[PDB]
């Protein structure tokens, strides 16, 4: 399944993922491609912040969906 992840800077990266993949896995994939540590990653889809433990299937994330990446500020 192709999905897109869009950053707040507007860059999109393309991932290949499956319904069985957890959000933890997706963040790992994003770190590989983009270099962002998972602990800083906050994903949003369908107006929901995505739970590391859950699968893309739990959120009904299908082909060509876009997830929004927001970074969580560590150290105000
Ligand atoms: Pt695929
Ligand atoms: Pt945009
Ligand atoms: Pt969007």
How much distance in Å is there from the Cα of 18 to the middle of ligand 2? 25
Q: Which residues contact 56 (CB under 8 A, 6 or more apart)?
A: 1, 3, 17, 18, 19, 20, 21, 22, 23, 26
Inter-CA distances, 54 with 9, 50, 74, Å: 26, 8, 23
Decide: helix, strand or coil at residue 13: strand
> Within 10 Å of residue 30's Cβ, how many Cβ atoms?
21
Please state, in angstroms and rounded to a whole number, the distance separating the CA atoms of residues 21 and 75.
30
The whole-angstrom separation of Cα 58 and Cα 54 is 6
Q: What residues pair up with 43 in beta bridges, in sequence order?
A: 69
Three-class secondary structure of residue 34 per DSSP: helix
DSSP state of 2: E
CATH class of 1-76: alpha beta
Residue pair 66/2 in contact (Cβ under 8 Å)? The answer is: no
Distance CA 1, CA 20 (A): 11
How far is the centre of ligand 3, averaged over its atoms, from the C-alpha of 44 (Å)? 9
Experimentally determined by: X-ray
Resolution (A): 1.8
For the chain, the domains span 1-76
């Amino acid at each position: 399944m192709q999905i897109f992840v869009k950053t707040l800077t507007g860059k999109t990266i393309t991932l290949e993922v499956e319904p069985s993949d957890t959000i933890e896995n997706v963040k790992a994939k994003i770190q590989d491609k983009e270099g962002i540590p998972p602990d800083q990653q906050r994903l949003i889809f369908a107006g929901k912040q995505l739970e590391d433990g859950r699968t893309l299937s739990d959120y009904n994330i299908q082909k060509e969906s876009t997830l929004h990446l927001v970074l969580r500020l560590r150290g105000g």
